[PDB]
Amino acid sequence: RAXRFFC
């Protein structure tokens, strides 16, 4: 996605 939560 944007890499806020899954990074």
PDB file of C-alpha atoms in Angstrom, residues 1-2 4 7:
ATOM      1  CA  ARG A   1       0.000   0.000   0.000  1.00  0.00           C
ATOM      2  CA  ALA A   2       1.720   3.339   1.164  1.00  0.00           C
ATOM      3  CA  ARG A   4       2.733   3.217   6.916  1.00  0.00           C
ATOM      4  CA  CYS A   7       6.783  -1.537   6.860  1.00  0.00           C
TER       5      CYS A   7
END
